[PDB]
Amino acid sequence: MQTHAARMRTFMYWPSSVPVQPEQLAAAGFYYVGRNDDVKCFSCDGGLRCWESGDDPWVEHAKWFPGCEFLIRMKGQEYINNIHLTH
Template sequence: MDLSNDKDIELYFYENRLKTYAGWPFDEGCACTPENMARAGFIHTPSDNSPDTAMCFFCLKELEGWEPEDDPVKEHKDHSKGCHFISLKKKVEELTVEEFYKLEKERLNFILNKKTDAEIKTFEEKAQEKRAVILNKAMDEE
């Protein structure tokens, strides 16, 4: 991720997160309206199987299976205790440049950790597959 990537920076702002909620299954009379979801830092990331999947643009935590009474802020805090965005005490527009860059540094840490975890998982899966091939060859040679 690059600080010059306007797309990533745009998601810091409520209006841009709200724009992602086309087709969101919950509306008026629910706690998890598009407005409340966007305020909590979520963007709508639906799939064919899960039309109610939402992900925090900051910590990348994905949640699905929303119920009408679910409070997005509470759910976000419960499922991602380390998210610096949901624990902000100020609006993004009120942050100093220094505060914003510190926050962005934390967001990039979340992204790097998620990518690293995925790479490690892929490596471990391939290592297990390779081990199985080697063991099968050793058994065949006996």
């Protein structure tokens, strides 16, 4: 699941009603585990579920798993710091 393309392949049967969708999820390191709206990061193994209207997969990645190596080398530490400045 190291590549954006491989992670996308898991999202073929992502539920239609979820207000967050595969392109943003897979970009943020997530792949679909095949149950409900549950996804996991390929790097930190953090899982997220219960996605809401307005959620951004990067923000949620930084909110819950700020020590993720993938996240730090993609968005940088300042981005992560800013997420926690206001939550």
